[PDB]
Design a protein around this ligand. Structure first.
Ligand SMILES: CCCCCCCCCCCCCCCCCC(=O)OC[C@H](CO[C@@H]1O[C@H](CO[C@H]2O[C@H](CO)[C@H](O)[C@H](O)[C@H]2O)[C@H](O)[C@H](O)[C@H]1O)OC(=O)CCCCCCCCCCCCCCCCC
Ligand code: CLA
Ligand code: CLA
Ligand code: CLA
Ligand code: CLA
Ligand code: CLA
Ligand code: CLA
Ligand SMILES: CCCCCCCCCCCCCCCCCC(=O)OC[C@H](CO[C@@H]1O[C@H](CO)[C@H](O)[C@H](O)[C@H]1O)OC(=O)CCCCCCCCCCCCCCCCC
Ligand SMILES: CC1=C(/C=C/C(C)=C/C=C/C(C)=C/C=C/C=C(C)/C=C/C=C(C)/C=C/C2=C(C)CCCC2(C)C)C(C)(C)CCC1
Ligand SMILES: CC1=C(/C=C/C(C)=C/C=C/C(C)=C/C=C/C=C(C)/C=C/C=C(C)/C=C/C2=C(C)CCCC2(C)C)C(C)(C)CCC1
Ligand SMILES: CC1=C(/C=C/C(C)=C/C=C/C(C)=C/C=C/C=C(C)/C=C/C=C(C)/C=C/C2=C(C)CCCC2(C)C)C(C)(C)CCC1
Ligand SMILES: [Fe+2]
Lengths: 176, 137, 97, 153, 51, 37, 244, 36, 27, 442
């Protein structure tokens, strides 16, 4: 049912085009990146604090010492990526900040869609395309898909409306 | 709603005799239709020639009429084009061509009646969906 | 002066019957004994000036001639519309199910 | 006319967009006059009804029904197997009230043109030149206020 | 009737003055079509300055 | 179908392919028995 | 000796017409009492010229060269038809069937793409009277049809079409339609072209001929959205003649 | 176009050989602890 | 059914562990 | 000092128990091959194409020429039974040796015998074990050659008259052909070694490989690695494992493309049609239908201006139109009769299509390798009815996944082998942190 909700939002709201969803995507995908890259960094900058080949045993929850080298981590990332964290507090605040902010941004966009206040179209593109039948972009291609979604799912998805679309009015490309 | 004898009653021939299938026959027919036919005729369409479907009204206008058990059983033995003018056993599964369509080899006369009955019953259940294609999925 | 000729054609007998000069071949399945054999001959021998001309297609058996007479009332002829006959569209107009 | 203007989807606040800026007049234009109430009939004199656009839909097909909800005419997408075209069904439109009162139109392109507008409700004459209106619906102060205050809350 | 100096072109004439007259697009300012200027087209001169 | 003389074994044959999966599971029963040592 | 598919595939040779030996300077005699067919006519374009627009009407525009951007997809081949002898001894080829069209797009200076349907559909081409032998000075001249480059099901990027599609600019629901009429109402052009075929090589033994062609026809008008360009095509041809 | 083809072939061959010969030049020894 | 055999076979494995942890073996 | 979840690392220096692990695992592989074959045979119905029945092992046996006749019809199921029984029986012998060496046998072999014992760092002993296995592999490649040339031949989908078992009398030996495949581009129309399209090249390639492997085996028994190789590699059991994981990964990705594109050593009769094949067969099918109705398929212009049925490839070859334009590199025995020098030949299309070609195209179009995870055949919008997922999709997807994970394992073990060899796989020595003795970057 949630999958249907996703698809409804594409076809009716053009939700993928909404900059608030885009900021949500960046915060979620950015959060997962931070999660993975921080865990890997810690696990591959560990200090040898025991003789075992399983390095988990050489940690003590009351030890005061850092269990991995911020210094070596910083050097690695500085040389690989150009920049690195140097401040552990900023690092972990940033990890809070990124996904929380992203989710907050997506919520704002959905508040807009409550009112059908969509980022549905680009007016400049529509003016050109109406006048110039050779003008085609990925933006116009995706609106055709939305149009398909709406006409083909509405009668069954909104049964209270009693939509009857005869075969001849369904948008369809050639052959399909 | 259920599978009553009324729905399971189909025309046997062009003269108006009818036959009532059992639920067993209908389910057998369905299973066999899936075995031997659905790869081309899923849902009552024809994937390799969509102009021709398994709707009862289409079959009624076939030459030999095929909207009855006898016409369908014969079709499975000796298929023709829609106007009856040409025999098409070499490109359509049939008992006549079970050498080149091996799935037809182990079909008995009773299996043929069951397949034919399924084809005639299913539009009574599914309506426009039978033969109507993706518009009605 | 700017009109869609296919929409215009739906306001003629084309929109009501099988137009022997324009209609796609799959329409001949709507009546008995016409598809595929006669349908193939009808389309190959178009265009026609009158519906009755179909009876003069060379080679009709007398059975075929009788099937046409039965069905002449389901046929019409209108002017050939280029948009409907170009592209081999009378054999395959891109519509399946 | 003031009552007829309310019965028009261009004044529905749920027809806007986030970045379609400015006044409603910038979209559909400055309303000048009610054109009149459009009545559609087929060639058998039966009255037909345009199915109205629901607010959810940026675009909507043109479907005409009889009083009982039966589809009797539409504007087809694929023409080849069209059954219900305006051309085939002989659909006409007559106006009562407004600027077009007592006028009837019968040429299919003109009739279709008013049926395209009837999905929006009552039909109005707009001035699109004064503001260089782009033809795309904007929301009202009711919409913008609600948006801002729900977001700030 | 629409030469570069009617069109507000300022650097185009300085390139043309010393021998750059064609575009990789295949036109030339003298109106000749279907010419290959090689690298030292208007575009190539511009790109060289950026680099 | 299997040759008729082994027909007796159809239901066992329907189960044989899965047995290698059981060796993996058996590795965990064994480790549960010795306390994941 | 001739080649196989696997010798040819991927080389570009599939888009080239058979050539005749430069020794082939014979004549193929014609008996008005026999009938003939073109068993294979091949047309291979080498040059696409497009006419320019000179702003005024007192200088007249030229045919300018263009660059092909659609690759080795341009030749017409396997064309066949009746070769008829007329009362006056002229010959008339009547195209019946074949791979007699190719979409092509060429690019002009400045970057404008010019699509066209390179075709000889419904070619009828005739010689001078009193032929009686096809020679290295025989010329065929004729006319053919140029249908619309897109056929009626073609949908533009906003979903509008002739036999299918929307009939309005649905993204501009309350825009004035009168301005959009040319883009909204599609139409299917059918124009004529002209072709000259100049026979320059003849193998009298085998019935094969070859030479040069020049064709003139219109480009794509995008279902009436804009005015077409005039196009001149030059290339080479090959044909094989058979008694019926 | 053939001049271009030749140039790229040469540039690619050159970099790939740098790569192969670089890693054959005692790479295991290029670390900060045990070099053997 | 088939569930008879897969039961006899399925118990063979745990059976081995059981017999060995009871006869205190080299587990 | 490994935890239980890394417990098989405790075997690295226990040659005897490690031998048992390997041999017991080998028993598992052979057991599955036997059990799975018997399961497939128990379920096999001869009247249905193999590829409607979820079979992946019977197709491999059939391809070797056992059980089948002309057209791929199954004529005798006994060879399938035999293959499965013998594998199954053999797995008990391997299981026996495996559990004996893992549990009861000498824990280390170095003491029981200097021949079977080994030290990972003994470059001479390691290359000798490698040499023996190369000889074994070479013999295995020659067994395929023996089958093809002296013991009944192989199934040849290209055989005239529908495909048949054929003895290979003139295998290709020309190294310009054999090694020419190794030099073809992996891109479209070329296909690297995946494009091998006849059994003569298949058998000759295996003669070459058999000889190459035997020669290299002899070489490695007799030599020790040269200094340049000594200094380029890590010499440790985990390193050697990592090298093999990389090789298996490579091989698995290749196998994936083989079964997806090749219809010679994966005959479509048994495996179902390839994706390209099915797409081409659709265009063939509607060309046939429409032509029978009177359409002139050569002159039919489609909506885009390109031919509806036929068009040119970018190098001019006449090919099927529509989206299948992408698949014009496809070659198959049902289609090649229609091909002339310039591609598809309009006169053959008009005159020489045979009923068996019509049937095969219709069969392949309706058995395209598309289907759902729960084995509903067709495109994702299709309704339930047809229970079908192509064996090619099953074999391609599985081996892509395995190949991917083995590349991950290569990276895992190669990185660990390097770090362990240099001594910092357990972490950074607090008292000798390298970065703390380097100059700062800024
Ligand atoms: C040493 C270290 C290794 C590093 C070396 C790097 C070298 C460059 C690698 C090139 C990558 C290839 C990309 C194109 C692959 C492709 O189009 O491959 C397809 C080809 C097969 O090509 C097809 O081959 C076909 C052969 O069939 C022909 O012949 C057949 C004969 O029966 C049939 O007749 C068939 O109908 C007919 O067409 C045709 O030629 C097709 O046109 C052609 O597309 O496969 C192939 O060559 C087989 C191998 C492809 C490997 C796939 C790479 C996957 C990468 C894994 C990435 C995971 C990364 C994880 C990172 C974390
Ligand atoms: C409660 C606030 C409020 C509301 C509801 C309105 C409502 C309206 N105004 Mg008014 N206005 C306001 C405040 C408000 N205004 C203020 C404060 C000013 C001074 C700047 C104005 C100045 C003003 C002018 C000058 C005009 C209007 C007009 C209008 C109408 C059109 C609005 C429009 O196109 O919006 C468009 C709205 C948007 C495009 C949304 C903007 C979205 C923002 C930029 C998102 C930013 C996200 C942020 C960067 C993310 C970062 C977060 C994180 C990563 C850190 C409408 C009735 C117009 C009109 O018709 O007047 C007659 C007009 O011309 N307004
Ligand atoms: C193919 C899978 C495979 C194989 C072949 C092995 C093999 C081995 N493991 Mg590894 N292991 C595996 C998977 C596998 N492991 C997995 C999945 C895990 C994660 C749980 C581990 C975790 C693990 C640990 C933690 C350790 C091993 C150890 C060992 C070795 C000694 C085990 C022992 O004495 O047990 C004694 C067990 C028994 C006496 C119980 C019965 C076991 C038998 C063999 C069952 C056989 C049943 C079969 C039906 C018999 C058919 C007989 C017929 C052919 C005649 C042995 C070589 C040990 C090692 O390295 O020792 C230094 C060790 O410490 N393994
Ligand atoms: C590794 C190669 C491989 C491949 C390509 C196949 C492929 C197939 N098998 Mg075989 N099989 C395999 C290994 C393989 N199997 C193994 C190892 C076993 C022993 C357990 C079996 C046991 C087996 C039986 C008992 C049956 C099949 C059947 C089938 C068919 C349907 C599969 C299906 O619905 O899966 C459904 C999909 C899944 C279960 C998804 C698994 C996703 C996993 C959990 C992710 C793992 C990620 C890591 C590895 C298909 C042809 C069926 C058939 O038609 O037989 C004729 C059948 O009845 N197979
Ligand atoms: C590659 C696998 C492999 C390897 C390297 C070893 C290695 C060893 N084994 Mg083990 N063993 C294996 C597999 C293996 N075995 C298998 C499969 C079994 C079950 C049958 C056993 C059962 C076994 C026992 C019971 C004992 C050993 C012992 C030994 C040691 C001495 C062997 C000896 O002197 O034989 C010398 C050489 C021969 C006897 C010649 C045999 C020739 C073979 C059988 C022919 C090749 C077979 C061929 C590949 C299969 C064809 C395919 C067919 C299915 C159609 C040595 C460390 C002994 C040991 O460790 O004592 C402490 C011991 O007592 N092994
Ligand atoms: C499982 C197979 C196998 C394995 C693991 C080894 C392993 C080894 N061999 Mg042996 N070898 C084998 C088979 C094998 N060999 C066979 C069959 C032969 C006979 C031809 C030889 C002949 C041989 C010789 C003659 C020599 C070795 C040497 C070596 C050592 C160094 C190898 C090296 O640096 O490679 C890394 C490879 C390179 C640095 C060169 C790369 C060349 C390839 C072709 C480039 C292609 C890359 C491309 C992306 C992949 C596509 C393939 C392409 C051709 C289409 C190493 C111990 C050397 C040694 O120390 O001998 C004692 C040595 O001089 N081998
Ligand atoms: C020839 C293949 C091969 C071999 C011999 C080894 C051998 C080894 N690996 Mg390597 N490994 C491999 C492939 C291989 N690996 C691959 C392909 C990967 C990437 C996925 C890895 C990733 C890997 C990691 C991350 C680590 C090792 C480690 C080790 C060592 C101990 C492993 C152990 O006890 O596992 C015990 C077995 C288990 C705990 C069971 C794991 C169960 C798997 C994950 C689930 C399988 C389910 C399957 C998909 C089907 C389920 C379907 C359905 C029921 C839902 C050992 C030296 C460890 C190491 O470095 O030691 C030096 C270690 O930390 N391996
Ligand atoms: C203080 C510093 C100011 C400097 C910073 C300025 C940064 C610019 C701010 C971005 C403005 C983006 C507007 C672009 C549109 C524009 O150019 O058109 C300019 C449009 C006016 O629209 C114009 O109207 C004209 C007739 O009046 C014509 O119709 C023009 O065609 C039309 O563009 O401006 C607005 O209407 C501005 C007011 C919008 C206020 C709405 C607030 C309600 C929304 C709540 C937002 C909360 C979200 C919080 C996020 C968390
Ligand atoms: C306002 C005004 C004025 C003034 C102005 C000015 C003064 C201006 C300036 C301007 C400028 C002064 C500009 C600049 C520009 C620049 C550029 C744009 C650059 C670019 C670059 C780049 C991009 C680069 C890149 C690179 C690198 C870095 C490295 C490697 C190589 C390369 C190339 C890649 C005046 C008085 C007249 C008056 C009027 C007003
Ligand atoms: C070490 C170890 C391990 C592993 C193990 C293994 C891996 C094993 C293997 C083993 C094996 C690998 C086994 C096998 C066996 C087999 C058998 C025993 C067989 C039998 C057979 C039979 C008896 C047959 C029968 C039949 C016939 C003959 C015919 C047909 C029918 C039938 C099928 C019935 C583990 C992890 C657990 C744990 C730890 C340690
Ligand atoms: C059978 C067959 C055949 C044949 C085949 C063959 C003959 C093959 C060969 C193959 C081969 C002949 C391969 C090779 C390979 C190689 C590789 C794969 C390598 C790699 C390398 C590496 C890996 C290296 C690395 C490195 C570096 C670079 C530096 C330093 C360090 C190191 C060493 C690490 C054919 C196709 C005809 C057909 C069918 C069948
Ligand atoms: Fe952390």
């Amino acid at each position: 049912a949630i999958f249907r909700f996703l698809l409804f939002f594409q076809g009716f709201h053009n939700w993928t085009l909404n900059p608030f969803h885009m900021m949500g995507v960046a915060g979620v995908l950015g959060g997962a990146l931070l999660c993975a890259i921080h865990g890997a960094t810690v696990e591959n900058t560990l200090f040898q604090d025991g003789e075992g080949a399983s390095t988990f045993r050489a940690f003590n929850p009351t030890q005061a010492e850092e269990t991995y080298s911020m210094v070596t981590a910083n050097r690695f990332w500085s040389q690989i990526f150009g920049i690195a964290f140097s401040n552990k507090r900023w690092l972990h605040f940033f990890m809070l900040f990124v996904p929380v902010t992203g989710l907050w941004m997506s919520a704002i966009g959905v508040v807009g869609l409550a009112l059908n206040l969509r980022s549905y179209d680009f007016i400049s593109q529509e003016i050109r395309a109406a006048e110039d039948p050779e003008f085609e972009t990925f933006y116009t291609k995706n609106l055709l898909l939305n149009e398909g979604i709406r006409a083909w799912m509405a009668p069954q998805d909104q049964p209270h409306e009693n939509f009857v679309f005869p075969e001849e009015v369904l948008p369809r490309g050639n052959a399909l | 709603a259920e599978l009553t004898p009324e729905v399971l009653t189909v025309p046997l021939n062009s003269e108006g005799k009818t036959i009532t299938l059992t639920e067993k026959q209908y389910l057998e027919g369905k299973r066999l239709f899936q075995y031997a036919c659905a790869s081309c005729h899923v849902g009552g369409i024809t994937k390799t020639n969509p102009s021709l479907d398994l709707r009862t009204e289409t079959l009624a206008l076939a030459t030999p009429p095929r909207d009855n058990i006898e016409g369908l059983v014969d079709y499975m033995k000796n298929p023709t084009t829609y106007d009856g003018e040409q025999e098409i056993a070499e490109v359509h599964p049939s008992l006549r061509s079970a050498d080149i369509f091996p799935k037809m080899r182990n079909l008995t006369e009773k299996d043929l009646v069951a397949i034919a009955g399924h084809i005639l019953v299913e539009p009574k259940i599914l309506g426009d969906k039978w033969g109507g294609g993706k518009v009605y999925y | 002066e700017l009109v869609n000729v296919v929409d215009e054609k739906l306001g003629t007998a084309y929109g009501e019957k099988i137009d022997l000069n324009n209609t796609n071949i799959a329409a001949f399945i709507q009546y008995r004994g016409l598809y595929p054999t006669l349908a193939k001959l009808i389309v190959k021998n178009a265009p026609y000036e009158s519906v009755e001309d179909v009876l003069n297609i060379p080679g009709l058996t007398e059975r075929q001639k009788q099937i046409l007479r039965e069905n002449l009332e389901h046929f019409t002829v209108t002017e050939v519309e280029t948009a409907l006959v170009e592209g081999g569209d009378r054999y395959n107009n891109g519509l399946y199910k | 006319e003031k009552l007829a203007f309310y019965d028009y989807i261009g004044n529905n606040p749920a027809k806007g967009g986030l970045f379609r800026t400015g006044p409603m007049n910038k979209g559909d234009g400055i309303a000048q006059a009610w054109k009149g109430h459009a009545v559609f009939r087929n060639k058998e004199g039966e009255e037909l009804f345009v199915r109205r656009m629901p607010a959810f839909f940026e675009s909507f097909p043109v479907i005409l029904t009889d009083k009982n909800g039966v589809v009797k005419a539409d504007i087809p997408f694929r023409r080849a197997e069209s059954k219900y075209s305006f051309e085939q069904q002989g659909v006409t439109v007559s106006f009562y009230g407004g600027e077009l009162n007592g006028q009837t139109f019968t040429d299919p392109p003109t009739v279709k043109s008013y049926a395209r507008k009837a999905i929006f409700g009552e039909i109005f004459e707009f001035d699109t030149e004064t503001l260089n209106s782009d033809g795309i619906f904007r929301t009202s102060p009711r919409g913008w206020f609600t948006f801002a205050h729900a977001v700030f809350a | 009737l629409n030469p570069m100096w009617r069109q507000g072109m300022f650097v185009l004439p300085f390139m043309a003055r010393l021998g750059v007259t064609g575009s990789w697009s295949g036109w030339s300012i003298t109106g000749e079509t279907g010419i290959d200027p090689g690298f030292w087209s208007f575009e190539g001169v511009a790109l060289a300055h950026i680099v | 179908k299997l040759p008729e003389a082994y027909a007796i074994f159809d239901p066992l044959v329907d189960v044989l392919p899965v047995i290698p999966v059981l060796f993996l599971a058996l590795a965990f029963v064994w480790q549960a028995a010795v306390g994941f040592r | 000796q001739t080649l196989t598919y696997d010798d040819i595939v991927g080389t570009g040779l599939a888009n080239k017409c058979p050539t005749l030996d430069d020794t082939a300077r014979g004549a193929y005699p014609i008996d008005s009492s026999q009938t003939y067919r073109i068993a294979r006519l091949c047309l291979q374009p080498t040059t696409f010229l497009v006419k320019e627009e000179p702003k005024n009407k007192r200088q007249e525009a030229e045919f300018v060269p263009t660059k092909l951007v659609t690759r080795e997809t341009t030749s017409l081949d396997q064309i066949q038809g009746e070769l008829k002898v007329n009362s006056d001894g002229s010959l008339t080829f009547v195209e019946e069937d074949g791979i007699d069209f190719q979409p092509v797009t060429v690019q002009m200076a400045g970057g404008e793409r010019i699509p066209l349907l390179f075709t000889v559909k419904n070619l009828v081409a005739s010689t001078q009277p009193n032929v009686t032998s096809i020679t290295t000075s025989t010329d065929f001249k004729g006319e053919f049809n140029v249908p619309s480059y897109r056929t009626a099901n073609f949908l533009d990027p906003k979903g509008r079409g002739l036999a299918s599609g929307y009939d309005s600019a649905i993204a501009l629901p309350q825009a004035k339609e009168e301005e959009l009429a040319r883009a909204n109402v599609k139409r299917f052009s059918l124009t004529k072209g002209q072709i000259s075929l100049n026979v320059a090589k003849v193998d009298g033994r085998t019935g094969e001929i070859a030479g040069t062609f020049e064709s003139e026809q219109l480009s794509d008008d995008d279902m009436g959205a804009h005015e077409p360009h005039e196009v001149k095509i030059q290339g080479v041809f090959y044909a094989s003649i058979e008694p019926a | 176009m053939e001049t271009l083809k030749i140039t790229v072939y040469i540039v690619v061959t050159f970099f790939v050989l740098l790569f192969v010969f670089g890693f054959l030049s005692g790479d295991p020894a290029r670390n900060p602890k045990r070099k053997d | 059914a088939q569930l008879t055999m897969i039961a006899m076979i399925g118990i063979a494995g745990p059976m081995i562990i059981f017999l060995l942890a009871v006869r205190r073996g080299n587990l | 000092g490994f935890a239980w979840w890394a417990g098989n690392a405790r075997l690295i220096n226990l040659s005897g128990k490690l031998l048992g692990a390997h041999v017991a695992h080998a028993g598992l592989i052979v057991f599955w091959a036997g059990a799975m074959t018997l399961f497939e045979l128990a379920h096999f119905i001869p009247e249905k194409p193999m590829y409607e029945q979820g079979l992946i092992l019977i197709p491999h046996i059939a391809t070797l020429g056992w059980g089948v006749g002309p057209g791929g019809e199954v004529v005798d199921t006994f060879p399938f039974f035999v293959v499965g029984v013998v594998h199954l029986i053999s797995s008990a012998v391997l299981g026996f040796g495996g559990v004996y060496h893992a549990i009861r046998g000498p824990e280390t072999l170095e003491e029981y015998s200097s021949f079977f014992g080994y030290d990972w760092k003994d470059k001479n002993k390691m290359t000798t074990i490698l040499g023996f296995h190369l000889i074994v592999l070479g013999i295995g490649a020659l067994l395929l050659v023996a089958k093809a040339m002296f013991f009944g031949g192989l199934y040849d989908t290209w055989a005239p008259g529908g495909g048949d078992v054929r003895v290979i009398t003139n295998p290709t030996l020309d190294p310009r052909v054999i090694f020419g495949y190794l030099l073809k581009s992996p891109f479209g129309g070329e296909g690297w070694i995946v494009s091998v399209n006849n059994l003569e090249d298949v058998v000759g390639g295996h003669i070459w490989i058999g000889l190459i492997c035997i020669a290299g085996g002899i070489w490695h028994i007799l030599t020790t690695p040269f200094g340049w190789a000594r200094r380029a590699f890590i010499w440790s059991g985990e390193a050697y494992l990592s090298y093999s994981l990389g090789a298996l990964s490579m091989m698995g990705f290749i196998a994936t493309c083989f079964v997806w594109f090749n219809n010679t050593v994966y005959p479509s009769e048994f495996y179902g049609p390839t994706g390209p094949e099915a797409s081409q067969a659709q265009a063939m099918t509607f060309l046939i239908r429409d032509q029978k109705l009177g359409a002139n398929v050569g002159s039919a212009q489609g909506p885009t201006g390109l031919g509806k049925y036929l068009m040119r490839s970018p190098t001019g070859e006449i090919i099927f139109g529509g989206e299948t334009m992408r698949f014009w590199d496809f070659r198959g025995p049902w289609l090649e009769p229609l091909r002339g020098p310039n591609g598809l030949d309009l006169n053959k299309i008009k005159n020489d299509i045979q009923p068996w070609q019509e049937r095969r195209a219709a069969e392949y179009m309706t058995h395209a390798p598309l289907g759902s995870l729960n084995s509903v055949g067709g495109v994702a919008t299709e309704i339930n009815s047809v229970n079908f997922v192509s064996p090619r999709s099953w074999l391609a997807t599985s081996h892509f996944v395995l190949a991917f994970f083995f590349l991950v394992g290569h990276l895992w073990h190669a990185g660990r082998a390097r770090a362990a060899a240099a001594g910092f796989e357990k972490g950074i020595d607090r008292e000798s942190e390298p970065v703390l003795s380097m100059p700062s970057l800024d």
